[PDB]
Amino acid sequence: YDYLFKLVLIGDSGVGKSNLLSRFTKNEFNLESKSTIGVEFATKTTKVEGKVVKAQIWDTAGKRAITSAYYRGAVGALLIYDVTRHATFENAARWLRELRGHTDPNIVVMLIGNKCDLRHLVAVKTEEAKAFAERESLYFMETSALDATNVENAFTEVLTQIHKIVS
Ligand SMILES: Nc1nc2c(ncn2[C@@H]2O[C@H](COP(=O)(O)OP(=O)(O)OP(=O)(O)O)[C@@H](O)[C@H]2O)c(=O)[nH]1
Ligand SMILES: [Mg+2]
Numbered sequence: 001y002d003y004l005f006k007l008v009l010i011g012d013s014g015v016g017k018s019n020l021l022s023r024f025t026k027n028e029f030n031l032e033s034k035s036t037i038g039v040e041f042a043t044k045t046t047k048v049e050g051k052v053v054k055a056q057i058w059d060t061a062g063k064r065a066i067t068s069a070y071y072r073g074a075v076g077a078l079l080i081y082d083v084t085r086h087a088t089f090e091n092a093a094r095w096l097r098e099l100r101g102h103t104d105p106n107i108v109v110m111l112i113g114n115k116c117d118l119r120h121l122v123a124v125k126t127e128e129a130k131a132f133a134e135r136e137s138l139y140f141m142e143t144s145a146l147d148a149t150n151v152e153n154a155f156t157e158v159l160t161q162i163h164k165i166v167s
Contacts, residue, residue: 001054005162006073007155010095011080012088013062016114019145020080021059029146036061039070048160050167055159069104076158076165077108080112081129083142084121089129096136108161110139112154117144122160 009017018036019029025042040058044054060070077099081089092111099109111133113124126142133140139157143150 001056002052003166004054004056005075005159006056006058007076007158008058008060008071008074008099009078009080010033010060010099011062011078011112012091012095015062015080015082015085016143016145017059017060017062017080020078020112020114020143020151021057023145023148023151025057027148039066044155046156046159048156049165051163054165055155057155064120065099068102068122071086071099074103075107075162077103077107077109078112078154078158079109079138080114081124083113083115083124084118086123089124089132093136094131096138100152106165108139108158108165109136110141110154110158111136113140113142115144115146116142116149117147 011017013035021042022028022030025044043056079092079095081092113129139156141150143154
């Protein structure tokens with residue numbers, strides 16, 4: 001734990017939060033996936049622009065005054081929606097204002113369109129998502145936990161920019 005960056009994943013149920021966490025930390029995809037009970041953790045150590053960082057990534061259910069303990073100390077946040085279900089992207093702003101009720105204004109937040117491997121079912125055009133990120137100063141990437149496309153880039157990018165702030 002040279003420096004340990006706590007990151008929280010948030011977003012509605014079944015957007016792929018847990019599988020995202022699984023593919024980044026252990027490189028595996030839980031097909032047999034159940035809704036997350038409580039909060040689960042997973043760490044990974046990587047070196048961002050030349051300084052070894054430990055990420056300590058928190059995960060919970062999309063569904064208890066545990067929110068404050070959930071967000072406490074988070075210096076990063078992945079706002080995940082499900083590219084194929086427009087209702088997941090719509091209440092991302094509602095996750096966003098909860099995430100800013102319980103964190104610092106300078107947290108590094110990436111909006112994430114997960115499941116980009118389901119190309120024939122995409123219900124969210126990337127320019128409405130890019131518009132929402134522009135409007136809110138969010139980073140943004142499309143990802144597939146199933147294919148691993150952009151998962152590492154999503155996390156390391158967050159980690160790198162966290163590093164630039166506190167370095
Ligand atoms: N095709 C495809 N399916 C995915 C992808 N990521 C997740 N899924 C599926 O979507 C379902 C939800 O996965 P989870 O990671 O458990 O969903 P979640 O966001 O963690 O939901 P909660 O933990 O209950 O809040 C699972 O059945 C996955 O198989 C993806 O990238 N591509
Ligand atoms: Mg889960």
